[PDB]
Amino acid sequence: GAIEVEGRVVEPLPNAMFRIELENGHKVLAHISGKMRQHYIRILPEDRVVVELSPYDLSRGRIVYRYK
């Protein structure tokens, strides 16, 4: 039930979405945040990310950080 969770990127999807596996065992789809878009942060499969999940749907969220 955590709302801020780390995961690994599985694959890019259209509309700037990514399939992610979280470290609580759940799959989610997320896009990068506006701040990350502004800073042109590349996301690739196998990257480690922090996701803020949607209150309305814990299977959707926003990527807010990608580990270097």
Curated annotation (Swiss-Prot):
<keyword id="KW-0648">Protein biosynthesis</keyword>
<dbReference type="InterPro" id="IPR012340">
    <property type="entry name" value="NA-bd_OB-fold"/>
</dbReference>
<dbReference type="GO" id="GO:0019843">
    <property type="term" value="F:rRNA binding"/>
</dbReference>
<keyword id="KW-0694">RNA-binding</keyword>
<comment type="subunit">
    <text>Component of the 30S ribosomal translation pre-initiation complex which assembles on the 30S ribosome in the order IF-2 and IF-3, IF-1 and N-formylmethionyl-tRNA(fMet); mRNA recruitment can occur at any time during PIC assembly.</text>
</comment>
<dbReference type="GO" id="GO:0043022">
    <property type="term" value="F:ribosome binding"/>
</dbReference>
<dbReference type="GO" id="GO:0005886">
    <property type="term" value="C:plasma membrane"/>
</dbReference>
<comment type="function">
    <text>One of the essential components for the initiation of protein synthesis. Stabilizes the binding of IF-2 and IF-3 on the 30S subunit to which N-formylmethionyl-tRNA(fMet) subsequently binds. Helps modulate mRNA selection, yielding the 30S pre-initiation complex (PIC). Upon addition of the 50S ribosomal subunit IF-1, IF-2 and IF-3 are released leaving the mature 70S translation initiation complex.</text>
</comment>
<dbReference type="InterPro" id="IPR004368">
    <property type="entry name" value="TIF_IF1"/>
</dbReference>
<dbReference type="GO" id="GO:0003743">
    <property type="term" value="F:translation initiation factor activity"/>
</dbReference>
<dbReference type="GO" id="GO:0005829">
    <property type="term" value="C:cytosol"/>
</dbReference>
<keyword id="KW-0699">rRNA-binding</keyword>
<keyword id="KW-0963">Cytoplasm</keyword>
<keyword id="KW-0396">Initiation factor</keyword>
<dbReference type="InterPro" id="IPR006196">
    <property type="entry name" value="RNA-binding_domain_S1_IF1"/>
</dbReference>
<dbReference type="Pfam" id="PF01176">
    <property type="entry name" value="eIF-1a"/>
</dbReference>
<comment type="similarity">
    <text>Belongs to the IF-1 family.</text>
</comment>
<feature type="domain" description="S1-like">
    <location>
        <begin position="1"/>
        <end position="68"/>
    </location>
</feature>
<dbReference type="GO" id="GO:0009274">
    <property type="term" value="C:peptidoglycan-based cell wall"/>
</dbReference>
<protein>
    <recommendedName>
        <fullName>Translation initiation factor IF-1</fullName>
    </recommendedName>
</protein>
